[PDB]
């Protein structure tokens, strides 16, 4: 059924939130094939999460840019190395039984969850401040 439940302490700008759900109900639906044995449905519910994920990070990248956010390098960097794991991942589902689905939905939980309370959580009031929404 449900992998991750959103909580208000992952709540971020309100544009923000809408991505990360989203995020969250694709790590939802991969979980969701994964427990029906379909690994079609997983592979393919994985590409668009991580093609989301990508286009989560411009967005947010956008964001450090035309605000002039100082941490804007850092974030970048951790965003992108997430990127490589993830299609590290990829690889393991050719192959892979709903068992090795399991084992990645656990690490995309583990990164995603981690990242928005620490990594994103940051760039909220210095944003918040300058009228961003
Ligand atoms: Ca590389
Ligand atoms: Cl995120």
Do not use: C
Not at 15 to 42: C, E, F, G, P, W
Not at 74 to 96: D, N, P, S, Y
């Amino acid at each position: 059924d449900v992998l991750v439940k959103w909580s208000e302490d992952l709540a971020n700008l309100p544009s923000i939130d809408t991505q990360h759900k989203r995020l969250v109900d694709y790590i939802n639906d991969l979980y969701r094939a994964a427990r029906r044995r379909d690994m079609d449905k997983a592979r393919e519910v994985f590409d668009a999460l991580k093609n989301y994920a990508v286009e989560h990070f411009g967005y947010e990248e956008r964001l450090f840019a035309d605000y002039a956010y100082p941490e804007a390098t850092r974030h970048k960097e951790i965003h992108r190395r997430f990127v490589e794991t993830v299609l590290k991942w990829e690889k393991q589902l050719a192959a892979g039984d709903p068992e090795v689905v399991m084992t990645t939905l656990r690490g995309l939980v583990d990164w995603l969850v981690n990242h928005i309370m620490k990594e994103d959580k940051k760039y909220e009031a210095y944003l918040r401040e300058r009228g961003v929404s």
